[PDB]
Amino acid sequence: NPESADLRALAKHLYDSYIKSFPLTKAKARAILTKSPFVIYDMNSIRIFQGCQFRSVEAVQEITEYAKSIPGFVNLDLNDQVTLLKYGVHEIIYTMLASLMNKDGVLISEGQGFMTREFLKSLRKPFGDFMEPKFEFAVKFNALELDDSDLAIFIAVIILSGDRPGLLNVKPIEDIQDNLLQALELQLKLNHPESSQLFAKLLQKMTDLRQIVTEHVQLLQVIKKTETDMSLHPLLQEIYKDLY
């Protein structure tokens, strides 16, 4: 079908841009998780929290590079470009994060290490429940068995939302997302012919994404007030400033 075909080209472009933007893919991660990592499972080896903040900022930079390649995005009103990244970039971080996680832990340091879930639950202060909600999401989301060619359209869909608070020209945004959603649907149908209504089920997962970020926001307010000693990068700080 002539319409399908355009969607197929779009998928390929997105997938290719994803590969260029994100050095550590789900495929490399799974290969590593199943070359092999040094494992950290207890103290014998705030610093960790600052590491996750460091990686986040880097991920924000990587996701911003990717977004620029989504057809139409850079042509949007520059203020709406800022708004979509502000409300979308963390939802994308937790998505990509699941790629690095299994039930028991998460890859760190470009894949060269693996820090266990339990170690992270045992941390002091208001830090023990810092990563947990992500592991809980990752486990449900990883069950969908998406791969990078699927994820690549999905995260695009997440960026191009016409319901983000305070958008000026919603119309141009909903036209692009309309496209990304058809592309994803086709992609999921072709790539997972036997998985029933996977499209429906992935989109429902978008719900837990939003719960993670708003819950992470609270947790940040807690941690910053208990530890007046703790830096928050201006980049993340600005993303959370308005928000919800």
Ligand X SMILES: COc1ccc2c(-c3c(C)n(Cc4cc(O[C@H](C)C(=O)O)ccc4Cl)c4cc(OC(F)(F)F)ccc34)noc2c1
Among 7, 33, 67, 120, binds ligand X (CB under 6 A): 120
Cβ atoms of 120 and 136 within 8 Å: the answer is: no
Does position 84 interact with ligand X (CB under 6 A)? The reply is: no
- Shortest gap between Cβ of 6 and ligand X (angstroms)? 26
Helix and strand counts by DSSP (H, E) for the chain: 10, 4
Nearest to 57 by CA among 214, 179, 238, 241: 238
Among 14, 85, 108, 146, binds ligand X (CB under 6 A): 108
> How many residues at the interface with ligand X, by CB under 6 A?
24
Interacting partner of 208 out of its own copies, ligand X, none (Cβ under 5 to 8 A depending on kind): its own copies
Does position 38 interact with ligand X (CB under 6 A)? The reply is: no
The answer to whether 56 is a known ligand-binding residue is yes
DSSP string, 154-177: HHHHHH--TTSTT-S-HHHHHHHH
- Which parts of 130-189 interact with its own copies (CB under 8 A)? 140, 161, 163, 177-178, 181-182, 185
Q: Which is nearer to its own copies, 101 or 108 (CB)?
A: 101
Distance CA 59, CA 89 (A): 9
- Per DSSP, what are the bridge partners of residue 161? none
Does position 199 interact with its own copies (CB under 8 A)? The reply is: yes
Adjacency order of strands within the sheet including 38-40: 38-40, 113-116, 105-108, 101-102
Among 26, 28, 86, 134, binds ligand X (CB under 6 A): 134
Cβ atoms of 104 and 29 within 8 Å: the answer is: no
Cβ atoms of 34 and 210 within 8 Å: the answer is: no
Among 14, 63, 138, 159, binds ligand X (CB under 6 A): 63
Query: What residue ranges bind its own copies (CB under 8 A)?
Result: 140, 161, 163, 177-178, 181-182, 185, 196-197, 199-201, 203-204, 206-211, 214, 244
